[PDB]
Design a protein that fits this description.
binds 5-hydroxypyridine-3-carboxylic acid; 4-stranded mixed β-sheet; globular; Papain-like protease nsp3; 6 helices; 3-stranded mixed β-sheet
């Protein structure tokens, strides 16, 4: 049993809810929250900007030190950093950004990072301002992630469309 409440079960291991991931992280304090990161860990907008704002910019300060030491992530890659006041850990995952021309096939590689963690609170990778079709992102998630994933979809309209269209 875990602390996640009000989710809709899609599969054996994937659950979904209409929720602000920031508000959900603050309530649950999950072991892992996933950030919709870019390779530079520049948390300017969407999930990353909202998560970073909720940490009072401590996520960005930590991220800048990580990049100064290690250089940029790969598209499809990830790193584990602090979850600050939101979670134990933040798994920063880089899905491909369609608005930068990145290979959508990298979305499966991005989701494979989730399999290193038994339970996660996450957004749909490459959705929102990353430009991918969220229906596609949910299908790749279900077909890739084997660990237990609790998806927080920000848009009520989109949430209802994801549920209604789910095969
Ligand atoms: O994860 C989301 O629900 C999301 C919704 N809108 C914009 C965005 O970048 C992400």
């Amino acid at each position: 049993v875990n602390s996640f409440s009000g989710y809709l079960k899609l599969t054996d291991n994937v659950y979904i809810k209409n929720a602000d991931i920031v508000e959900e992280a603050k309530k649950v304090k999950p072991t892992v929250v996933v950030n919709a990161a870019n390779v530079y860990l520049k948390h300017g907008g969407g999930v990353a900007g909202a998560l970073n704002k909720a940490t009072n910019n401590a996520m960005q300060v930590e991220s800048d030190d990580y990049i100064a030491t290690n250089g940029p992530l790969k598209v499809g890659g990830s790193c584990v950093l602090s979850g600050h006041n939101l979670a134990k850990h933040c798994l920063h995952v880089v899905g491909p950004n369609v608005n930068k021309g990145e290979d959508i096939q990298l979305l499966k590689s991005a989701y494979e990072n989730f399999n290193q963690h038994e339970v996660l609170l996450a957004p749909l990778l490459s959705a929102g301002i990353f430009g991918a079709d969220p229906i596609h992102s949910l299908r790749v998630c279900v077909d890739t992630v084997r660990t237990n994933v609790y998806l927080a979809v920000f848009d009520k309209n989109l949430y209802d469309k994801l549920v209604s269209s789910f095969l």
